[PDB]
Design a protein around this ligand. Structure first.
Ligand SMILES: OC[C@H]1O[C@@H]2OC[C@H]3O[C@H](O[C@@H]4[C@@H](O)[C@@H](OC[C@H]5O[C@H](O[C@H]([C@H]2O)[C@@H]1O)[C@H](O)[C@@H](O)[C@@H]5O)O[C@H](CO)[C@H]4O)[C@H](O)[C@@H](O)[C@@H]3O
Length: 388
């Protein structure tokens, strides 16, 4: 008769997701979806505990960079059969990189829900007040550093820039200097290359040296997007997932393709919905995953709410996103895809990220240096992954 499934997720706060659930329930009168939301910072720890303790959600959200951990643990249902029998589902209409993110050992273990990237988001009022020209798509690091220096006004608690100094940010920033985290087959790390020391130093000196970016102490108890909303950051490197937050920013703002150094490199992220291997309700969970992936009404809701980008590439579905404002320069989101760098795909990503993030924080707090942080991170990766 009636089936009630659980869906565990992070990427929605609840307007858009609630409307998608309502539409799903209308179109699938025998299936009720009970949503549990966890903040991104705690989601994966919480999810793993739920699963390992024997009460996995029927369906749950995964990001690109945690997918392999789950796929390799065996907690996801193989969706091969479900997809074969979903006769009208046509994955050739989806973004291929986003769809492929949820494949493991040649099998689809998740349905792609959304994809996204990071841009430079800038406060035009601050730029105009200082007489600084806006970011361009052909800036290099030195143009943003010079802009950031002229836009910092220490007595008024205004910083020129803010960018995460984390493993997730660093695989991109390293690539902007021709560096990388792993070799092609994931058997060695080159995280401590000289170009990577320069790349990390570019980030950490903004906090510790030129003081154009707020430090951990300055951000204590808050997040950079909160300082940005408070008029205190001229340039913020963050995702398109914050465009909804920023609609009521009390200043004019716009976006630009991020600057590189030896080359451009931009983030590419994707979320997918997996079905628990142990669920008794896999058909219903799959129908919800499939809806979220490819249903046109879901895609239109997503677009209307600026909630990342839908998996579908259809131009009529995407047009309202290009026409929506703020920000005006919506084309920067799509221009950035030319320079994308995919997340490394390794089962220990979150664990190695935690260690590296602690090392990077120590540089920002004046307890370490970029070279020591990268040496320590190389050692920890080698031990964790057994590299020869
Ligand atoms: O749960 C909603 C939303 O939370 C997070 O967004 C806020 C977060 O953004 C910036 O940090 C991110 C960092 O968390 C990491 O993000 C990768 C992740 O981004 C999206 O998920 C966001 C969270 O980031 C989530 O939807 C995307 O949907 C997901 O697929 C990706 O895995 O890494 C990026 C790059 O370094 C970073 O921008 C911001 O710095 C931070 O302060 C803010 O709290």
């Amino acid at each position: 008769d009636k089936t009630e499934i659980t869906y565990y997720q992070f990427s929605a706060p609840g307007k858009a997701l609630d409307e998608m659930v309502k539409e799903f329930e209308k179109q699938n009168p025998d299936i009720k979806v009970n949503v549990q939301t966890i903040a991104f910072n705690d989601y994966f720890t919480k999810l793993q505990t739920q699963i390992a303790g024997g009460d996995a959600p029927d369906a749950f959200e995964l990001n690109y960079e945690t997918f392999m951990q789950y796929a390799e643990k065996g907690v996801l249902a193989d969706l091969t059969s479900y997809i074969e029998k979903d006769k009208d589902f046509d994955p050739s209409t989806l973004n291929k990189q986003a769809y492929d993110a949820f494949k493991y050992d040649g099998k689809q273990y998740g349905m792609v829900e959304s994809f996204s990237n990071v841009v430079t988001i800038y406060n035009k009022d601050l730029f105009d007040k200082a007489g600084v020209e806006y970011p361009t798509a052909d800036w290099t690091w030195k143009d943003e550093e010079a802009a950031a220096k002229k836009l910092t006004d220490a007595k008024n608690k205004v910083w020129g820039t803010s960018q995460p100094v984390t493993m997730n940010e660093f695989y991109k920033v390293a690539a902007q200097n021709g560096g990388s985290i792993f070799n092609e087959d994931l058997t060695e790390t080159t995280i401590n290359s000289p170009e990577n020391v320069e790349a990390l130093t570019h980030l950490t000196n903004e906090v510790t040296d030129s003081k154009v970016a707020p430090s951990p102490a300055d951000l204590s108890g808050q997040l950079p997007e909160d300082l940005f909303m408070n008029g205190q950051i001229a340039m913020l490197h963050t995702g398109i997932w914050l465009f909804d937050m920023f609609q009521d920013a009390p200043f004019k703002w716009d976006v630009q393709v991020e600057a590189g150094n030896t080359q451009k490199a931009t983030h590419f992220f994707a979320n997918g919905i997996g079905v628990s291997k142990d669920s008794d309700k896999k058909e219903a969970a799959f129908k919800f995953a499939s809806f979220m992936s490819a249903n046109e009404e879901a895609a239109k809701i997503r677009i209307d709410n600026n909630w990342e980008l839908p998996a579908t590439e259809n131009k009529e579905i995407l047009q309202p996103y290009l026409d929506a404002t703020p920000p005006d320069n919506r084309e920067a989101v799509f221009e950035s895809l030319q320079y994308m760098v995919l997340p490394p795909v390794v089962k220990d990503w979150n664990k190695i990220s935690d260690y590296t993030n602690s090392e990077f924080e120590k540089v920002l707090n004046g307890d370490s240096t970029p070279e020591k942080a990268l040496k320590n991170s190389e050692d920890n990766i080698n031990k964790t992954m057994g590299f020869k």
